Amino acid sequence: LTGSSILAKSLKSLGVDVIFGIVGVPVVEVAEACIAEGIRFIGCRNEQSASFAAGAWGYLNKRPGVCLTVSGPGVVNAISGLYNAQANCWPMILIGGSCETNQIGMGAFQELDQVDACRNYTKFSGKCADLETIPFIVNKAYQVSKAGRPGPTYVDLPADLIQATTSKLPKLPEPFETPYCLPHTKDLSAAIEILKNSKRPLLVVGKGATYSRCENELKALVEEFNVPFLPTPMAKGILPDNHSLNAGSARSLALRKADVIVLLGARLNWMMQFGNRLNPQTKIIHVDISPEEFNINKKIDIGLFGNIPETIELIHQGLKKSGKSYSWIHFKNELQPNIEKNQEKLQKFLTAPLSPLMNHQQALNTVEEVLSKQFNGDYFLVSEGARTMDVTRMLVSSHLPRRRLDAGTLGVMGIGLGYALAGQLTHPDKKVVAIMGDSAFGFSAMEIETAARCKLPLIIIIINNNGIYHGLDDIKSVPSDKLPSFTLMPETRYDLLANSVYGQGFLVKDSTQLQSALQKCFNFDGVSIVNVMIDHRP
Amino acid sequence: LTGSSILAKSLKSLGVDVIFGIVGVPVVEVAEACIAEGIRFIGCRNEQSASFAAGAWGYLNKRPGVCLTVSGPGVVNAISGLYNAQANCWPMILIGGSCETNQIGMGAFQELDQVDACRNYTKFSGKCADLETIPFIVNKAYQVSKAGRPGPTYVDLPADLIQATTSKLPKLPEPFETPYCLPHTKDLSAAIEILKNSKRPLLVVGKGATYSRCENELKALVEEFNVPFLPTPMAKGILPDNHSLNAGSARSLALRKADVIVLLGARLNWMMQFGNRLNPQTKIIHVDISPEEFNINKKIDIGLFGNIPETIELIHQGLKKSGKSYSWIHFKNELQPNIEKNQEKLQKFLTAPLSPLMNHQQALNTVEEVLSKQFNGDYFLVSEGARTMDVTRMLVSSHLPRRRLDAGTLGVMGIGLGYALAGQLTHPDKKVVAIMGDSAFGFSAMEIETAARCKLPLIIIIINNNGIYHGLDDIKSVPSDKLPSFTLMPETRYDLLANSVYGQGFLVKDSTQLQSALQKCFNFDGVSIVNVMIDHRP
Amino acid sequence: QLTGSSILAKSLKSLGVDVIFGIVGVPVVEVAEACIAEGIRFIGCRNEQSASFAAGAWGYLNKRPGVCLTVSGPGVVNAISGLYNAQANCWPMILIGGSCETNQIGMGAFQELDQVDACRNYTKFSGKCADLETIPFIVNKAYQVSKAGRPGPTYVDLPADLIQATTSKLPKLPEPFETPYCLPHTKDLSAAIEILKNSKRPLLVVGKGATYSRCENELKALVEEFNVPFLPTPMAKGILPDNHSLNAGSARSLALRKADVIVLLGARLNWMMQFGNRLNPQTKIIHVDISPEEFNINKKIDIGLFGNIPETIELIHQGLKKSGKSYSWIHFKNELQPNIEKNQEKLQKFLTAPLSPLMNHQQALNTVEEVLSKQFNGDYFLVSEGARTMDVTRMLVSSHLPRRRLDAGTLGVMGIGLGYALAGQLTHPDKKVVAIMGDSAFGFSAMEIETAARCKLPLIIIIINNNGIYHGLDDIKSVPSDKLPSFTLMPETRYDLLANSVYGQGFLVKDSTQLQSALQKCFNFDGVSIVNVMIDHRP
């Protein structure tokens, strides 16, 4: 028994079956011990992507993802994923090797107080003091990351413990089911009365709801009482985007005109403009597991402190108790004229003359037609970029829960390939399509070798406008000192990157090439990159 | 006048001429304001590389490099380069946009306390409170980064200031020459007397000595009195690797046998094994600008608190005053049998059977022959990896000061392309060769597009053994759960990445093809990638 | 046969530590007792605030780190006040904190706190002893770092499992190492000399970095050979006497504004100098400091002299001697005489103010100065703390010797009064320590009178009592409790009677005659004396 194998056995007793990371001094022994215990190891090319993958994996699987890094710069690179998981409220454990304990203060190799470096990004950050305490620290990180509001944790394994030996196996952690809570009956009763008296109720469904896996309870409630709902971006698909009660296509109007809003796992942070655009007379019912979230940015009527799935059901039962036959389809019907105006605005983009290239909307509309016909809603989507991501949110539909990851609460670029790895590993029998802007893609592009090596046959679609929001179409005549900050190199051949990893690449300039390229990606055993050149202009 | 242009005018008045970064919300207007003031902007593909480039550029240029990032995850990604510059003692300024000030606490877009996030990685971290204080904060970061022991600083620009306008130009910073200091005369005289009584003195020359640009003084001293010297890795070349007084080829014996060691800008940290292998009877003279560095890890005899170049010259004048002539060539000559024994050990690697692929030594010995014939030492070298870096240090020689950058005090992977950009921008008339392991390369490989776009014709040599220290030559038959953590995909075709950016790539498997490929890189107007497949075994 | 306690103690003793301030508990009492067994005196205080304040002041006074010892958790948190103080003042000290058992971290251990992190932003070095063999390295690093360069506080963490661990092998103990200093570059030095050579109105601004570095003899030689006007900051008062013929302190504002050259000697252009904002932009500034990050930040300077203050003064002096010109800048001091007289007339207006029937601040402190002047002729030790009390003490109570004055300093912190007095009395057992404090200031640390009585430190405490913070009420009996003003304390609180709690002597004083009589009884008393001086309560 070594520090490595006790760490590995502790993770194994808690059900960990895949770890992302990059090895070296001193943690290669830790990774090989985990593999020796039957835990798969996904070696990445940058710890940014490894720690993004771990966080997304935790969100998808409702249990902590695990990331493993070397000391010093390994952990510092992974702070990007700690910050990401903390913002997204996603469970994960970052395990970092650290320098020899008795060399701290001497300028040890990759010396860093890594517990302190991670403390403000995590719900728990701690160091294994000795071999006997390894299970305790691992278990504490595991339990804490998944409890209450989920988030990341940090576990430090100093070099002198990794290679330390013992003959006595410390008591290993045993699984513990996360206890949850329910709203107080008084609050739940008041919220039920608010809904009963409402004329225009609106369920706002966030990624806390999809994480908690409330899709069945939400569907039963929405469909029995015709309750309009509106998903946040990663909640798209919890019910299909084309569901008859989905108000997503009239988002701004539905929010302004609703007289009751039920927030289901969604915060009134920047994504909801802090609640500033809500009618002050709207009554707000907030369902969250973090009680510190209630009545901060915006006055709310009722805070329902409880688990989303059971809370939906309790509200649904409350409405059934009266025996009355509530229906709010009228509110959804009232949003129909605004939905048709928004559709008419989209059509103007779709019929714009070719430049001779397509614009964002024309390219992504073709993608949606192709993907819809091939998969009928059953695949996995990763979405990242600026204009590429917003247009993908409008045009590329979701039909199942937790089949969509995007830049999230941070609006972080660089999650594309890590999230796609996590998605493919969670759904080995499904196709994973990652739709990325050309700028976004360059943050994590080298993980295509990780995907190829780990037999993850990703489909990568790059919407390429030669820069950030827009670009130049010729830089050879621009004096280098005056090269604008937003442009990338015109017609960068991201498609040819696929050949470095024995994949397949396609350069696409028109809808015919786009359709034909995508048809060749559906059954390819490897990485496909579709590099779609679009109009560079703003 | 905006926050953006007051920032840009402040940097320009302090002589800033190039900035690395990535733009977005809310920092696009800042980069464009810098460009309008005549400051060149290098848009990168990940903030890791941009912040590594700024720190390298500061070291090479003896004034702070500048890195610009967006709020939240932009700054967090750049903490890797802060940590790196702090560890290397390199001057730089990280300029981060941040969220609207009156939205802190509300879950603003990319909300992060960025002053605090950067506080422990920097000599100064501060926020611009209003338009009037921007020059003060910029000037403070600039002066602090380069004073004393150099290091990184952080300047926060909130989004409400970036967009703020005024008609009053604040007083702009004026350049100020960094004050140096000299050792106390009593300590200097004691150090001179120690050297006069020495029989086997050794000058240990670190990258503080190259940063302070002491090559002229060092040469004069070494050659007049025949004083053996030993460079640390990035000090290689301060005098040529084949200089007749260079003890680098008998490094452990020279350190073991010296009766006096003069530490010139080098720490007794992990790179010197904390001084643990030095003879306890060896007298130690330590020249540093950081007095907190003296007499911590190892008992020393004299701390010379002073600027390295002037201190070398004062020691030299002190020896020259005595009239009695000094020559320590005998010490160097005593090292020759060990130099020879080390060359014969190297020769066993160079003549080892081919697999049919070369080993690290055979590949890099060929690279050195080709580079030496072409440039006669006059080029720029970046070196990154584990075995690849160690063998490059042994075999690829340096002949001029500050023409070599490697993984440094952190042993950090991922600095390769960022260091190459800074080196090429500092020496536009020289060739930049980056010798990277295959694992190392994957951390920063997408910056080849930055190099192509900004007209930086890098020559990239990848020493490819299919993984980290070693790899497998076949993963097709390995069950995915048992894939080892150290391996990468066999024969990943990094050479083909060059085609994505209209460069040129070469797959190379023997010394003949390596020489032929390298000869085609010397005058190519673009990025060249030579992918050298070597034996995968450990 | 050695323990963590004794390896720590022997490590401190080999580095010359001879006194430690602190408060013991679990398990650090074994550490203090091992220190006492090695010949190190332990000063047990009543609050860690005062202990850490005392350690920092002791460091300043003695030009070597003071040492503070506390228990885990709230012991260390209480001492962060003194770390912040020593950091702001640039004073060398080591805080030594016990911490919880290492293998209980994360479990909710008794007084569990990441104390290394807690102290990190307040210290130059914060570290933990990982095992018995590394105690000397950590202690030595804290000791060397605190005194090198710009001095400052450090933190050493001693976990409970280490305090109690035993070994039969003695680790190598630290050996003393003389702090290396630097000298300014010759180019900068020659440029500074040439600036001074061409000056008509030069001014040496002498700060507490100058007094810490002990440059009084070099400064005196330069000032007196060439008649160079100078101006001390509050704790530099006395480096040359307040009544030295070249002292411009009585015309501070005019001298600063009219100088054509300012030499800053261990003084910063921080809030205490209004950030340089009142200086004439045409004035040339020469800044002598050991922290190069200080140059050209708040204010444009001409020359940064990166070097040790005493040698740098001497090198400037020698540079002026080299020409053979008989430089004399007494004329600039003489130009300040109208302003000095105007300020003295302003003060005399306060001294002749009618009694109310109580004295005002100026009258009480002028009487104090008359008594102290007749009793000591300048040779005593002064601690000064308060708001108005402190400002009037600075104007009226004179200093005549270097490092004989401590006040609220860079933090303007209330609560240093008795800890500083303890350090001053321990540093000068052959001198009398007078602490002049406002009534509000005194209440922060007053219980340390028992520490002084217990440790045979015969402090003389003078409280200038106006019933509150800057001002007070003279009656609160008829004020409804909800409406009691925030600035007032209880009228005529009998701080003098506190002296009886520790077998000292106290005096209630309401006029200058009683003040004189009471003070005269304080100079030869074996114990603590407190003079409670009731003054006018109005603003």
Ligand SMILES: Nc1ncnc2c1ncn2[C@@H]1O[C@H](COP(=O)(O)OP(=O)(O)O)[C@@H](O)[C@H]1O
């Ligand atoms: N099981 C659960 N029950 C209730 N609320 C939860 C649960 N898990 C997470 N949450 C909450 O869901 C919220 C997620 O909000 P956010 O990440 O802003 O979603 P979105 O970005 O989709 O609006 C967090 O406030 C979190 O506390």
Ligand SMILES: Nc1ncnc2c1ncn2[C@@H]1O[C@H](COP(=O)(O)OP(=O)(O)O)[C@@H](O)[C@H]1O
């Ligand atoms: N101008 C200078 N004069 C003296 N010392 C310097 C100067 N600039 C930097 N230094 C010192 O040089 C040292 C660099 O050492 P280190 O980075 O460990 O070098 P290496 O890795 O080459 O051994 C630091 O201690 C730093 O304080």
Ligand SMILES: Nc1ncnc2c1ncn2[C@@H]1O[C@H](COP(=O)(O)OP(=O)(O)O)[C@@H](O)[C@H]1O
């Ligand atoms: N030996 C020394 N040589 C030169 N400067 C020093 C020395 N010791 C301390 N200093 C400097 O003295 C200055 C003290 O300034 P400060 O505390 O503001 O003084 P004051 O409050 O009296 O104005 C600090 O900047 C510190 O770096």
Ligand SMILES: Cc1ncc(C[n+]2csc(CCOP(=O)(O)OP(=O)(O)O)c2C)c(N)n1
């Ligand atoms: C880590 C990080 N760095 C920088 C940014 C700023 N940013 C926001 S979107 C974006 C890229 C936008 O370009 P692209 O992905 O090509 O999309 P487009 O809008 O051109 O379709 C960038 C760099 C960010 N959000 N995160």
Ligand SMILES: Cc1ncc(C[n+]2csc(CCOP(=O)(O)OP(=O)(O)O)c2C)c(N)n1
């Ligand atoms: C940021 C970071 N992550 C991980 C490591 C661990 N590490 C050390 S060397 C190395 C790469 C070794 O492989 P390669 O560059 O191919 O060199 P080889 O030894 O195979 O020649 C890695 C990942 C590191 N030093 N820094």
Ligand SMILES: Cc1ncc(C[n+]2csc(CCOP(=O)(O)OP(=O)(O)O)c2C)c(N)n1
């Ligand atoms: C630790 C701390 N708490 C509070 C303050 C605020 N403060 C400044 S001066 C002062 C006391 C002023 O009253 P006193 O000491 O009686 O003097 P007076 O001006 O009334 O003569 C206080 C509380 C401080 N400086 N430090």
Ligand SMILES: [Cl-]
């Ligand atoms: Cl745009």
Ligand SMILES: [Cl-]
């Ligand atoms: Cl190996």
Ligand SMILES: [Mg+2]
């Ligand atoms: Mg784009």
Ligand SMILES: [Mg+2]
């Ligand atoms: Mg390799």
Ligand SMILES: [Mg+2]
């Ligand atoms: Mg008062």
